[model samples]
Target: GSSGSSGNVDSNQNKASMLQARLNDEAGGTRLLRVHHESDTEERGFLEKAAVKKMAKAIMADPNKADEVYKKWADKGYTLTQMSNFLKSKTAGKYDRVYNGYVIHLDY
Candidate 1:
């Protein structure tokens, strides 16, 4: 038996793939970003944000293949928390790291 997806499928198939991939990229990366926070979930938010900023800066300073590593991490199904920790560790000696409700100390 064959299932049909015949309603404007031609115009929509590539749309789905392209847009879906873009969304996946955002979901895989952007979901972890945040600003200062007082505590708990939002505290972790700022922590991840610090890790990311420092990691990005470190990549620029050192010329690591960041995008390749990002793909490798994503492919390995790492949660954002674990990925953030990896970046934190990678940048450990380079900066201080984490947060508050405002003026959070990004010590990464």
Candidate 2:
């Protein structure tokens, strides 16, 4: 029984590693595309910088805006991390749908 349980644990670990490797490969492909685009023109990097600046300005313009957003989403059954993941995916224009329930933003 102990050996059987150990084997099951090993199988689970292997599955997790495989999933992680697949995610890494996908991310690596995305990075390669980003790099290629960045190298294709000077404007790509400048645009990205401008976008970051704009996003920062928007966030700073209203200190309580994010908290209000979070509460609104949470009231609709979204956790803090769910809200963060939603924002990140939206900002990056990625259609991801996984939430880990870990808050990336905190007051304390």
Candidate 2 residues 1-108, lDDT tens each? 355544433344333454434334333333343334343456643554444334334455555454554344445564444344434634654222212212443333
Off by over 4 Å in 1: 1-41, 72-108
Sliding window of 10 residues with minimal summed lDDT for model 1: 99-108
lDDT, residue 3, candidate 2: 50
Models 1 onward score TM values of 0.27, 0.25
Cα lDDT listed for each candidate? 0.45, 0.41
Instruction: Give lDDT tens digits, candidate 1, residues 27-101.
Output: 344466677867455665466556555545555555445544455435545454554454455553532322010
- Which one wins on lDDT? 1
